């Protein structure tokens, strides 16, 4: 019950010293490749996809929701807010907040998405509404990135996130216009060239959302359009034993390369 690809991922994990979780869904045949697919991992920034998607869902019954002005106050600034800091004492729309959270990993923007949903539980509720019984958001930014081993808060499994990402970006979890907007945002991500995409052939295209947290937690979730093939959905989660561990985007790139070579 261990494939050549799973063995390679195990070897990669062993050399890395951490814990690796992978889930691939190949839409050419719906087959899946999992490595620690049912183990929980801290989502970190990858959770921003669920929050933005939940707001997109709300916009389906409110054509003007995404244009609503949201006030940004000095007190709203958290640890990393490259976009929101420019708008302090001004306003940003939910579309701007979604774009900032997804493409720049802006934490103040993520907090506004969470607040629009009524708190972290509002994000979890949306996940449940779309068939994801695993995902859980328990805290806001930046504490949702503590990534403590064994802590179930703000975690999901690779299998669950891959299934959900497929439903959101390729399936019908969102309306057609909303699905297109989410894909456009992911494709425009600025922080993913060293992660999953680094392990793919240059000719391929993709959209992704990275995650970075304590315990050297290094994550990436992507929707990929390989050259001449139906799209793939790939989740790569990685976490380490020490709180101050360094990021390892190279491990995610390696996992993606193994997955690509195994197709």
Write the DSSP assignment of 109-150 as a string of letters: HHHHHHHHTTSHHHHHHHHHHTT-SS------TTGGG---TT
**Domains in the chain and their CATH numbers?**
1-263 (3.40.710.10)
Experimental technique, in short, is: X-ray
Q: Spell out a b/e string for 124-133, using b for 16 or more CB atoms within 10 Å of the CB, else e.
A: bebbeebebe
Compute CA 92 distance to the chain's CA centroid, rounded to the nearest angstrom.
22
Q: How far apart are CA 163 and CA 89, in angstroms?
A: 39
List the resolution, Å: 1.5
| Four-residue CA torsion sign, 161, 167, 169, 175 | negative
| Four-residue CA torsion sign, 254, 154, 173, 97 | negative
205-213 and 69-71 as β-strands: parallel, antiparallel, unpaired?
A: unpaired
List the Cα angle 98/99/104 in 5-degree steps: 115
Locate 16 and state its tokens: 């890395």
Q: What sections of the chain are H helices per DSSP? A: 4-16, 48-59, 94-104, 107-116, 120-129, 158-169, 176-187, 249-261
205-213 and 155-156 as β-strands: parallel, antiparallel, unpaired?
A: unpaired
* Residue 81 DSSP code: -
Q: How far apart are CA 249 and CA 244, in angstroms?
A: 15
């Amino acid at each position: 019950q261990t494939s050549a690809v799973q063995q390679k991922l195990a070897a990669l994990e062993k050399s890395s010293g951490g814990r690796l979780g992978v889930a691939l869904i190949d839409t050419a045949d719906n087959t899946q490749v999992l490595y620690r697919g049912d183990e929980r991992f801290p989502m970190c920034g990858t959770s921003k996809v669920m929050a933005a998607a939940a707001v997109l869902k709300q916009s389906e019954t409110q054509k003007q929701l995404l244009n609503q002005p949201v006030e940004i106050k000095p007190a709203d600034l958290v640890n990393y807010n490259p976009i929101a800091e420019k708008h302090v004492n001004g306003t940003m729309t939910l579309a701007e907040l979604s774009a900032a959270a997804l493409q720049y990993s802006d934490n103040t923007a993520m907090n506004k998405l969470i607040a629009q949903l009524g708190g972290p539980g509002g994000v979890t509720a949306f996940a449940r509404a779309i068939g994801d019984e695993t995902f859980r958001l328990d805290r806001t930014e930046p504490t949702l990135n503590t990534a403590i081993p064994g802590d179930p808060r703000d975690t999901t499994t690779p299998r669950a996130m891959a299934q959900t990402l497929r439903q959101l970006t390729l399936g019908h979890a969102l309306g057609e216009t909303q699905r297109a907007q989410l894909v456009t945002w992911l494709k425009g991500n600025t922080t993913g060239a060293a992660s999953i995409r680094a392990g793919l052939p240059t000719s391929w295209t993709a959209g992704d959302k990275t995650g970075s947290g304590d315990y050297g937690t290094t994550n990436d979730i992507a929707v990929i359009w390989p050259q001449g093939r139906a799209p793939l959905v790939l989740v790569t989660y990685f976490t380490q034993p020490q709180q101050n561990a360094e990021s390892r985007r190279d491990v995610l790139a390696s996992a993606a390369r193994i997955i690509a070579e195994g197709l």
